[PDB]
Ligand binder design. Structure first.
Ligand SMILES: Nc1ncnc2c1ncn2[C@@H]1O[C@H](COP(=O)(O)CP(=O)(O)OP(=O)(O)O)[C@@H](O)[C@H]1O
Ligand SMILES: Nc1ncnc2c1ncn2[C@@H]1O[C@H](COP(=O)(O)CP(=O)(O)OP(=O)(O)O)[C@@H](O)[C@H]1O
Ligand SMILES: [Mn+2]
Ligand SMILES: [Mn+2]
Ligand SMILES: [Mn+2]
Ligand SMILES: [Mn+2]
Ligand SMILES: [Zn+2]
Ligand SMILES: [Zn+2]
Lengths: 351, 345
DNA sequence: ATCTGTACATGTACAGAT
DNA sequence: ATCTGTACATGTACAGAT
DNA sequence: ATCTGTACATGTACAGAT
DNA sequence: ATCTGTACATGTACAGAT
């Protein structure tokens, strides 16, 4: 029943194969262009992230996320007004500086210009660059070989120092993945992507946001308290399956209802990270109990909506569901929709 | 009772501190000599190994193992007979015996250098132990004034795929898992100048892999961590090591046995019984008793396969006589059936 | 002659197809 | 249950640069 | 190239709580 | 007796400086 829904959401190998071949060609060509001698982005490296590379993409392989990450040694960070997530950042990049402050907007604008130039010279493939969207750190490619595929090329600064202080009590995996895992994860770099809002606030053009997309990918692919969870000599859990179901519920509601424009799949991802922390035992995600596991995720998400509280998993003081970011009305609208589907056998899964 | 024995075997923080301070001085000075000096071993790097660095040393901090590992440009290995563990090495040109990199020549120069440097140490009472023909180590004897031995082990580091003899080894797939096993086998492998029984042959070492396993020994990621549950795996290893050590002190008949037999056996047992709840501290007695039963079965079948190299039998007749295994069997069974009176010594 | 940034070589987990 | 395409970590060969 | 600084894992040690 | 919290000690991966 839920299993039949998962059957419908499963990607097909033929679609995967055809989509990846084209995405890989485009991305490699753009990455090579970035290495040309006079490029401010020479030395940028690729990191594939997001649902496709975590194996939780649903319905079709039609949206791919790729970070083009540039190491920026000897950075000093200044927190933007105690928000925990947003920072000012203070030589190939000297053209993007205003005094000692690195402009996210100048740097993103040049990045976009280079990508557009290279895209125009692709005659192989039907590909174009989507109009910039406010609040996005990405240059998005629209590929039509024939099926529509979007690729988000995300500009990111790489810093190898210790993670900012706002993350100190974040990543609360000690009871689940453990202390050695958390220590090792926090020794990896952290990333900053352009905030890129057009909201008339101070430093609009120069504000960067923390990204832990690499850490999140690791977690999704190494998600059990037991080392053998979902391995060929261990037991299958239903953690990724619950994430896929919850993502589908949101995707379906969002297609129908403009009232839900403020919500995105990262809200669901964040909520399930909290549930995986609350219920760390693999036996609490037994496949035989798929319905009750999905049901408890739903109940948890409803509580987050109704109490207006969903803390960023890495930055606990940052509340993704504050009234400042999302209206009461929107949260209540979504709450009623979720409770309806839950209590009437998920008719939206049949559409 | 077993817990009281463990209390006696526990190292004291003050002894640890005093022993490590002296060991670290001597080791650092030898490692530095191997460098800025125009030695064939320039670029050798330190890797601490064995029971002290795995936190399973018992009784006193009086025996330390250190590898001085040298990366060597793509070598070619030829298995010695079909021993699995021993190899001739081809492509430091000073250490060739017509094209083969001689374990004896290379170890001899290494040992010469260490001896020379040791003679110039004036602040610490340290000497080099007479060479043992079976040993890949240059062994130091420190009087601190307590007696401390340090094994400085020369090792070639190779970054290639592990040799074919290890293909079915490291059988951790059901315990630590496939990602762990794959990642482990992506690390280098080591060759130490332990001769086959000759002079040119080298032997495989996985001391780095063994150390990782002892530090990451649970099916659960949180085993023995501050937000997980304590298991009794290392405590059973300590107890079994002490039983062998005590029997070996009393009976010369047991000279062919060593702690690495016990280590190998418990690796096998941890693979057979992977679940952390099968090693609950409340069940220390049962756990130690099943380790004993397992070891007795290894003795009775004359079979103890190297954990990494399955065709290498540490209990073959060629290495250990039938009578020696039977002698040990009887001793172990006596201690087991009389409540371990040797633990009270 | 050597050095090297770039891309191929090797190996296998994950999960879809049969 | 087996077979099989993709992703990806790490080793290494080498055209072009020095 | 080498070396120090940081962070926190692994331990010992012991009082107070359970 | 064990568990839990704090203090005190060593080992170790790796960034950044030199
Ligand atoms: N607001 C945010 N805060 C932190 N990280 C974010 C974020 N938005 C996106 N990300 C990161 O960037 C990745 C890609 O984002 P999206 O493409 O928008 C979604 P997704 O996780 O890939 O699933 P989907 O594309 O199937 O909906 C996320 O997986 C997450 O790691
Ligand atoms: N026969 C062998 N084969 C492979 N590796 C061996 C070996 N003998 C010793 N080693 C490696 O070298 C390490 C140190 O060896 P030893 O000092 O002889 C023992 P130990 O494991 O340190 O315990 P112990 O010194 O408390 O008795 C071992 O732990 C192992 O990793
Ligand atoms: Mn995505
Ligand atoms: Mn995206
Ligand atoms: Mn030792
Ligand atoms: Mn030794
Ligand atoms: Zn799982
Ligand atoms: Zn444990």
């Amino acid at each position: 029943k839920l299993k039949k829904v998962l059957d419908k959401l499963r990607l097909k190998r033929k679609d995967i194969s055809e989509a990846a071949e084209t995405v890989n060609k485009v991305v490699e060509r753009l990455l090579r262009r970035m290495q040309k001698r006079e490029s401010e982005f020479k030395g940028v490296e690729q990191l594939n992230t997001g649902s496709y590379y975590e194996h939780v993409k649903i319905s079709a392989p039609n949206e791919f996320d790729v970070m083009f990450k540039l190491e920026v040694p000897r950075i000093e960070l200044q927190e933007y007004y105690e928000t925990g997530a947003f920072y000012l950042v203070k030589n190939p990049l000297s053209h993007f500086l205003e005094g000692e402050v690195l402009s996210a907007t100048k740097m993103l604008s040049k990045f976009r210009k280079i990508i557009k130039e290279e895209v125009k010279e692709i005659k192989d493939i039907d590909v174009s660059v989507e109009k910039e969207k406010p609040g996005s750190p990405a240059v998005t490619l629209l590929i039509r070989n024939p099926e529509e595929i979007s690729v988000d090329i995300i500009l990111a600064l790489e810093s190898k120092g210790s993670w900012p202080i706002s993350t100190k009590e974040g990543l609360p995996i000690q009871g689940w993945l453990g202390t050695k895992v958390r220590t090792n994860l926090r020794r990896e770099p952290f990333y900053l992507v352009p905030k890129n809002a057009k909201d008339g606030n101070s430093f609009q053009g120069e504000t960067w946001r923390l990204s832990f997309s690499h850490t999140e990918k690791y977690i999704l692919n190494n998600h059990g308290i037991e080392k053998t969870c979902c391995e060929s000599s261990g037991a299958k859990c239903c953690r990724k399956e619950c994430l896929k179901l919850m993502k589908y519920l949101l995707e379906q509601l969002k297609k129908e209802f403009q009232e839900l424009d403020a919500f995105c799949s990262y809200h669901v991802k964040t909520a399930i990270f909290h549930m995986w922390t609350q219920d760390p035992q693999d036996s609490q995600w037994d496949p035989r109990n798929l319905s009750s596991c999905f049901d408890k995720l739903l109940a948890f998400f409803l509580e987050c909506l109704r109490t207006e509280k969903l803390d960023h998993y890495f930055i606990p003081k940052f509340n993704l569901f504050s009234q400042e970011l999302i209206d009461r009305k929107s949260k209540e609208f979504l709450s009623k929709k979720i409770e309806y589907e839950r209590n009437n056998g998920f008719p939206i899964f049949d559409k």
